[PDB]
Design a protein around this ligand. Structure first.
Ligand SMILES: COc1nc(N)nc2c1C(=O)N([C@@H]1CCCCC[C@@H]1O)C2
Ligand SMILES: COc1nc(N)nc2c1C(=O)N([C@@H]1CCCCC[C@@H]1O)C2
Ligand SMILES: N[C@@H](CCCC[NH3+])C(=O)O
Ligand SMILES: N[C@@H](CCCC[NH3+])C(=O)O
Lengths: 462, 462
C-alpha cells in the first residue's frame, strides 16, 4: 500500500517543480571520505569544513524543529544528518518531514559536527532519488532474486560482493606478475569442447546454423600455445547445460591457465601459490575463519597422493590400471560403465570424502582424461592432478597432451560412446610445445575459502 | 603429401624409443632472455654461459658436419642454433638431418656464441614437438580460420594479438586507478535488455525454458548502482543476433561503466582520458600511425556538438524536437518510421560522415534513447553523447534515467511497437542514485586506433 503513497509524493514533487530524480547533485565526498577526514572529533563540537554528501536514508527520527536521519552510503558507511529549523528551515523542515521516506537517496550540504556520532548539520538539502518501495525490515531465495535490496540491507552481502571482486583481481594480479597474458577466446563455437558437459545451443540468424556456448576455453587456449603464447590464461564464464547443485551451476566463472615447458608438477606449485596469494590479498589470512566457527589452515605445503595407490590403501588391495571392471564392479558392490570411471568413483567414495587438509591427488585413469598426456613412466595413467581444498573439488592441472595422433584416438574412443574437432586436431598437428594447463572454479574457490554457498558468491544467479 | 612423411617420422620416432612429444624439456631461458643477456657480443667469439633453449625451427640449412637452423620462440624472437658433428654428433647429426623438419619445436642445450648472428652451439638436443604439417610459405579468411598458423608465420598477427591484450589491460588499469570495481553480471538472462538488438536464445535443460544471452550488461550494472556500488564496470562479451559487417559482429567484447553522482558531461571527460591513456600505454603515442600512411591525432581536447543544431546547420534550417516526421521524411527524400530515427539518420548522413577529428555529439532524440534521462533544460532531448573517433561510432555515455515511472513509459512505448522487465523496473523503484554510464566496443576501439579490421582484432572470429 505504501507503494501508492510513495508514487503520489513523486507525482506531487514533479508538479511543484521539485526534481525527485535530478540529473546532478554536487556531492563533494563519500561518507567514508568524511569519516577518514574527522576520525577523532571532540564529541558535541562543530568544525567549519563544509561538505556536500549524498546517501540512503535508512533511519529517520523527526522531532518538531529538529530531525535526525542516518545516511548510509552505498558501501555501508554511515553519516548522520540533522535537519534543523534554525539552520535553513521551516518550509525546508516541513518538506523534509513530508517528502523524505526510508530508502530515499538524499543529498545534504552543510557543516560537519559531532552530536551529544558524526553528523552533518544542513544548510541545504535535496532529494536525489525517491524510492517507490520501502526496504524490508529475508529468505535465501529472495535475497538472490533481489540482490540489489540484499546489498542495501545486509552488510554481509556488501562484503561478499566486494570479496569476489577482490579475489578475481588477486587472481589477475598473481598471474600477471608471473607473465601470463589474458586472452579472449570465443564463447560461441561451432562445437564446444575442452570438458565433459552437455552444451547450450543457440541458433544464429547470421549463419542459419546452431552454435554452442563454450563449456570450456581449453581447446582455443591450446591454439594460443600453438600460436606461440608462452603463458596465457582466461578468466570468464563457461556454460554447461546440466543440473544445479551446491557445487554446480549452469553458468559459472572459471579460470584456465596454460604454461609452456612445465608439467603438472609445475602447475601444482603455481596453483598452490596462486590460491595462497589470493587468500593473503583478498582475505588477509591463511587461517581461514568459517561460519562453522572453525579455522581452516591453507598455509604451508600441501600433500600429494596418487589415485591408484591411495585407493589401494583404502580398499586393502592393489588396484592398478590392469584391474578389470569386473573386479571394480565387485568392490563397488561390496561398499554400496568403464575402468576409469570406476576408479575415480571408488577413489572419491573412499579417499576423496576423507580428506580434510588441502591435498592434490595425481596420476589419473587414461580413459577419463582424454586431453591429458600419458604419464612419463607409469603405464595406464595420465599426468593430471585434482586439488581438494576443504573437501571441495577446486582445481585441476594437466601435463597437456600435444600428440595429434594419440589425441585423435582419445576423441575417437569418446565418440564411439562421428565428427571430431578437426580444427583443434589440425592445430595440434602444427606442433604444440610441451605445456601444463590448469582449470579452477571461482565459486568453488570462494566456497572453499569462506564457507559461502555458490548462491551467495555470484552477484545475480538463477 | 608431406603430411604422410611427417606422420611416419613420428611413428618411427616412437618405435625407436625417442619421444617426439616429451612431457618435459629443461628450458632455462626464452630466446628473448638470451638476447637481452648478450646484447653486444664480439661477433665470432664464444662465451661459457650454458643455456637450454627451445624454439620452432622455421629455417634449416644443412651442410655435412654442420647444420644451422633458426629457432623462433613463440613471441617472434629468434636464435640460431648450430648442430655440429664435433660438439656431440655423428649419430646426433644424422638424426638432426633425418628427424627435424620445418615447424618442429626443438630444444637445444649448449654454449652461446656469435657466428661469422647470435647462436647456440649444441652439446645436447631433443625434439620437443613433431609437426605433422609444414608451415605455408595467406588470404584474410584463412588467416582467421587458422589464427594459430597466422601467429606462427606473420609477425603482425603476433603484434596485434598482444596489442588487444595490452589495450584491455590498459582499460582495467585506467578504471581501477579511478576506483571502479569490475563486476560479473549474468550472460544468460530470462530476458535480454540494455540495448536494441535481437537476442540469441538457448534452451535450458535445468529449467526447461528458453534463456537469452545478454545483449548488454546495463540493466544488471544498474542493479549494482541501486545496491550501492559507487563505481562499477564490466569488460566482457555481449551477443547480438544480427548480421556481420566491418563494424558489427554477433559476438564482441564491450566495456560498460557506471559512476554515481556525475552526468554525461562527466563521463565524456573520463571516456576521453580513458582512450588517451589506452593509446599512451598500449601504443605509446597519441599521433596514431595508420596503414593508410597518414597520422590521426587524438591528443588534446575533443569537440562537442549538439545533434539538432549541428543537423540544423547542415540542412540549412531549424530542426528541433518539434519538427514533424512529415518534414523530416521530405528532407530525407530531397537528399536520397519515427521522429527520433529520422533525426539520427539525417544527422548521420550529413554531419556524421563529415567528421574527421574526434568529436562528441550530444543531446539526442528522446524516442531512440529509452534508458537515458531527459535533458535537464532542453525539452524533447536526452542527455546522451556518442563519441566518433576517426569516423567510427566508438562509445556512448548517458546521464542515466533513474525515474521508475518515466522508465516504465519508455518501455511501454517500445513494446507497443507486452511483457516489460519488471525486476529491472522494481530495482529502479528501490531508488537508483543519479549516475552516468558509458558503453564502448573494444574492436571499434582497436579499429579507430590502428586501422585494423574487426576480423584482425579478435583472436578467433567466425
Ligand atoms: C559452480 O562451479 C561449477 N559449476 C559447474 N557446473 N561445473 C563445475 C563447476 C566447477 O567449479 N568445476 C570445476 C572446474 C575445473 C576445476 C576442477 C573441478 C571442476 O571441474 C566444474
Ligand atoms: C564489433 O562491435 C560491435 N558489434 C556489434 N554487433 N554491435 C556493436 C558493436 C559496437 O562496437 N557497438 C557499440 C557499443 C556501445 C558504444 C556505442 C557504439 C556501438 O553501439 C555496437
Ligand atoms: N577444461 C578443463 C580445465 C583445464 C584443464 C587443463 N588443461 C575443465 O573444464 O575441466
Ligand atoms: N547498453 C549500452 C551501453 C551503455 C550506455 C550507458 N548506459 C549499449 O549497448 O548501447
Amino acid at each position: 500500500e505504501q507503494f501508492r503513497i510513495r508514487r503520489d509524493k513523486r507525482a506531487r514533487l514533479l508538479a511543484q517543480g521539485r526534481d525527485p530524480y535530478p540529473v546532478a547533485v554536487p556531492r563533494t565526498h563519500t561518507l567514508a571520505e568524511v569519516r577518514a577526514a574527522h576520525p577523532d572529533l571532540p564529541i558535541d563540537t562543530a568544525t567549519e569544513d563544509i561538505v556536500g554528501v549524498a546517501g540512503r536514508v535508512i533511519f529517520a527520527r523527526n522531532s518538531g524543529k529538529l530531525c535526525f536521519a542516518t545516511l548510509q552510503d552505498g558501501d555501508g558507511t554511515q553519516l548522520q544528518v540533522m535537519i534543523s529549523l534554525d539552520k535553513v528551515g521551516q518550509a525546508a523542515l516541513d518538506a523534509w518531514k513530508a517528502d523524505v521516506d526510508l530508502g530515499d537517496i538524499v543529498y545534504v550540504h552543510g557543516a560537519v559536527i559531532s552530536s551529544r556520532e558524526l553528523s552533518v548539520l544542513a544548510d541545504c538539502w535535496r532529494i536525489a532519488a525517491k524510492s517507490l518501495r520501502p526496504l524490508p525490515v529475508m529468505s535465501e531465495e529472495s535475497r538472490v532474486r533481489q540482490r540489489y535490496v540484499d546489498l542495501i540491507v545486509r552488510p554481509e552481502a556488501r562484503a561478499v560482493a566486494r570479496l569476489r571482486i577482490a579475489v578475481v583481481r588477486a587472481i589477475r594480479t598473481a598471474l600477471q606478475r608471473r607473465g601470463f597474458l589474458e586472452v579472449e577466446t570465443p564463447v560461441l563455437q561451432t562445437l564446444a569442447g575442452g570438458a565433459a558437459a552437455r552444451p547450450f545451443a543457440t541458433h544464429s540468424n547470421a549463419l542459419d546454423i546452431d552454435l554452442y556456448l563454450r563449456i570450456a576455453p581449453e581447446l582455443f587456449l591450446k591454439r594460443c600455445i600453438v600460436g606461440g603464447f608462452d603463458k596465457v590464461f582466461e578468466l570468464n564464464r563457461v556454460f554447461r547445460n546440466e543440473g544445479a547443485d551446491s557445487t554446480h551451476s549452469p553458468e559459472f566463472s572459471m579460470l584456465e591457465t596454460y604454461q609452456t615447458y612445465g608439467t603438472y608438477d609445475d602447475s601444482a606449485v603455481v596453483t598452490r601459490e596462486l590460491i595462497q596469494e589470493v587468500a593473503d590479498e583478498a582475505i588477509g589470512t591463511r587461517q581461514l575463519p568459517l561460519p562453522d566457527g572453525s579455522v581452516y589452515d591453507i598455509d604451508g605445503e600441501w600433500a600429494t597422493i596418487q589415485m591408484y595407490p591411495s585407493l589401494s590403501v583404502a580398499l586393502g588391495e592393489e588396484i592398478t590400471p590392469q584391474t578389470t571392471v569386473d573386479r571394480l564392479r565387485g568392490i563397488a558392490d561390496s561398499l554400496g560403465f568403464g575402468h576409469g570411471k570406476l576408479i575415480e568413483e571408488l577413489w572419491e567414495r573412499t579417499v576423496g570424502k576423507s580428506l580434510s587438509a588441502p591435498t592434490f591427488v595425481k596420476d589419473f585413469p587414461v580413459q577419463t582424461t582424454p586431453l591429458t598426456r600419458q604419464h612419463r613412466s607409469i603405464p595406464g595413467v595420465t599426468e593430471k592432478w585434482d586439488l581438494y581444498l576443504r573437501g571441495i573439488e577446486l582445481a585441476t592441472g594437466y601435463s597437456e597432451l600435444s600428440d595429434p595422433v594419440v589425441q585423435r584416438e582419445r576423441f575417437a574412443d569418446q565418440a564411439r560412446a562421428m565428427v571430431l574437432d578437426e580444427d583443434f586436431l589440425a592445430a595440434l598437428e602444427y606442433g604444440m610445445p610441451p605445456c601444463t594447463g590448469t582449470g579452477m572454479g571461482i565459486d568453488r574457490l570462494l566456497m572453499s575459502l569462506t564457507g559461502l554457498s555458490i548462491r551467495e558468491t555470484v552477484l545475480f544467479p538463477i
